[PDB]
Design an enzyme around this catalytic site. Structure first.
Site, PDB file in Angstrom:
ATOM      1  N   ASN A   1       3.373   0.137  11.846  1.00  0.00           N
ATOM      2  CA  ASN A   1       3.051   0.621  10.502  1.00  0.00           C
ATOM      3  C   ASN A   1       2.696   2.102  10.448  1.00  0.00           C
ATOM      4  O   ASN A   1       2.069   2.671  11.367  1.00  0.00           O
ATOM      5  CB  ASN A   1       2.029  -0.324   9.927  1.00  0.00           C
ATOM      6  CG  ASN A   1       1.005   0.309   9.107  1.00  0.00           C
ATOM      7  OD1 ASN A   1       0.275   1.230   9.566  1.00  0.00           O
ATOM      8  ND2 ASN A   1       0.787  -0.280   7.919  1.00  0.00           N
TER       9      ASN A   1
ATOM     10  N   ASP B   1       0.798  -1.223   0.000  1.00  0.00           N
ATOM     11  CA  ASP B   1       0.000   0.000   0.000  1.00  0.00           C
ATOM     12  C   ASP B   1       0.845   1.295   0.000  1.00  0.00           C
ATOM     13  O   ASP B   1       0.298   2.412  -0.130  1.00  0.00           O
ATOM     14  CB  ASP B   1      -1.078  -0.055   1.104  1.00  0.00           C
ATOM     15  CG  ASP B   1      -0.517   0.074   2.493  1.00  0.00           C
ATOM     16  OD1 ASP B   1       0.716   0.121   2.644  1.00  0.00           O
ATOM     17  OD2 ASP B   1      -1.286   0.278   3.430  1.00  0.00           O
TER      18      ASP B   1
ATOM     19  N   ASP C   1      -6.339  -1.799  20.653  1.00  0.00           N
ATOM     20  CA  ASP C   1      -7.263  -1.258  19.584  1.00  0.00           C
ATOM     21  C   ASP C   1      -8.490  -2.165  19.286  1.00  0.00           C
ATOM     22  O   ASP C   1      -9.308  -1.811  18.503  1.00  0.00           O
ATOM     23  CB  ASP C   1      -6.445  -0.948  18.285  1.00  0.00           C
ATOM     24  CG  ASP C   1      -7.256  -0.230  17.218  1.00  0.00           C
ATOM     25  OD1 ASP C   1      -7.651   0.917  17.482  1.00  0.00           O
ATOM     26  OD2 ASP C   1      -7.543  -0.828  16.128  1.00  0.00           O
TER      27      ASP C   1
END
Ligand SMILES: [Cl-]
Ligand SMILES: [Cl-]
Ligand SMILES: [Cl-]
Ligand code: NA
Length: 129
Positions: free
Chosen positions: A59, A48, A101
């Site tokens: 990331n 990506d 998360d």
């Protein structure tokens, strides 16, 4: 810096990773092994166009700023270069947000494919902790 196994386990434990969100120390060590081979300078470019940084391959799509990942966030409020330091404080603090998360350690695909359900205690066997 390339850490030794038990050296990394000690550094993680001191920074409060051991049993963080229920994940025993060996999970984190396992994750670090397969993400970076214990090398704080590890980087990997994703398809990506984001990049993964550091001992836990955090990331730039969501967690740090590298100035070159369009449309990304910086939820750890750090430059991605801080994830490459020989001191793991920034990596650990940002891992804590990541594993909180919702998906636990499944956030790390290599944890899910290579550590999850395995005898992760072997990663801290013999370490003076
Ligand atoms: Cl363990
Ligand atoms: Cl960016
Ligand atoms: Cl969980
Ligand atoms: Na970013």
């Amino acid at each position: 810096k390339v850490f030794g196994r038990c050296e990394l386990a000690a550094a993680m434990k001191r920074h409060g990773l051991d049993n963080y969100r229920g994940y025993s120390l060996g999970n984190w060590v396992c994750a670090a092994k397969f993400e970076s081979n214990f090398n704080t300078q590890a980087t990997n470019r994703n398809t990506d166009g984001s990049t993964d940084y550091g001992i836990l391959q955090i990331n730039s799509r969501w967690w740090c700023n590298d100035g070159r990942t369009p449309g990304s966030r910086n939820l750890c409020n750090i430059p991605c270069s801080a994830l490459l330091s020989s001191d793991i404080t920034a990596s650990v603090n940002c891992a804590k947000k990541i594993v909180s998360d919702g998906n636990g350690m499944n956030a790390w695909v290599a944890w899910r494919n290579r550590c999850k359900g395995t005898d992760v205690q072997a990663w801290i066997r013999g370490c003076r902790l």
